[PDB]
Design a protein around this ligand. Structure first.
Ligand SMILES: [Pt+2]
Lengths: 120, 104
C-alpha cells in the first residue's frame, strides 16, 4: 500500500546522461519516448528508433522492425537480449546494436560512428 | 535529429486487471510507471517498489536493493529471473516475490 513503484532495465543506456550530453555538447537531437502508434509523426529520413526488450517480445519486435525498415527508418537496439546474440538482432533488421552498457557508445553513434556493434 | 525510444514494458502485473484498480479502487494506494534516481524523494515507510529485471544487470539490482533496504523501502519483484530461483531474489533483500492481495 501507499505509493507503489516500478523499476525496469532498459538499463543499457542512461537517459539522464544522454539528455545531459545532448544538451551540453550542443548536438542537434530530440529524444522522446514513443509508443509504436506514435510516429510516423516523425520523418524516417531524420528519425532513429531505439529498442529495448527482454528475450521475450522478440516476435513483435521482429515484426515492428521489418515494418519500420519498410518505412525507411534507422533502427538501433540494446538491453539484456541484444547483449547476447547481437548478430541475430543485426540479422533481424536493426542497423546498429549496443551490447552491455551503451551510455557512451550511443553518443558516439549520434556523433556519427557507424559500427554495426558497439561493445559493452 | 530524432531519436525515439521504444520500451516494451512487459509485465507480470496481470494487465490492468490488477493495475487499473490501484488507480480506480485505491484511495490510499498509488501506482505509476517510474525509474531510479527518483524513488529517493518518496517516503521509505509508505513506499512499495516493484522491480522487474533479467539475469543481466543483476549487480545494479543488488546494489539498489542494498541502498533502498538500508533506507527502509519495501521492495517486491517479478519476472523471468525472479521466477527461476525466487529464493535467491529473496536473499537479495526483496521482501516478497511474485498481486492485489498483497497490497491489502
Ligand atoms: Pt526484464
Amino acid at each position: 500500500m501507499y505509493i507503489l513503484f516500478r523499476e525496469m532495465k532498459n538499463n543499457w543506456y542512461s537517459l539522464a546522461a544522454l539528455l545531459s550530453t545532448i544538451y551540453s555538447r550542443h548536438l542537434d537531437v530530440e529524444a522522446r519516448p514513443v509508443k509504436f502508434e506514435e510516429i510516423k509523426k516523425f520523418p524516417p529520413e531524420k528519425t532513429i528508433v531505439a529498442y529495448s526488450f527482454m528475450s521475450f517480445d522478440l516476435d513483435t519486435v521482429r515484426e515492428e522492425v521489418k515494418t519500420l525498415k519498410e518505412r525507411g527508418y534507422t533502427l538501433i537496439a540494446g538491453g539484456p537480449h541484444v547483449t547476447a546474440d547481437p548478430e541475430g538482432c543485426l540479422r533481424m533488421g536493426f542497423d546498429h546494436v549496443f551490447t552491455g552498457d551503451g551510455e557512451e557508445n550511443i553518443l558516439k553513434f549520434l556523433m556519427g560512428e557507424r559500427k554495426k556493434i558497439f561493445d559493452g
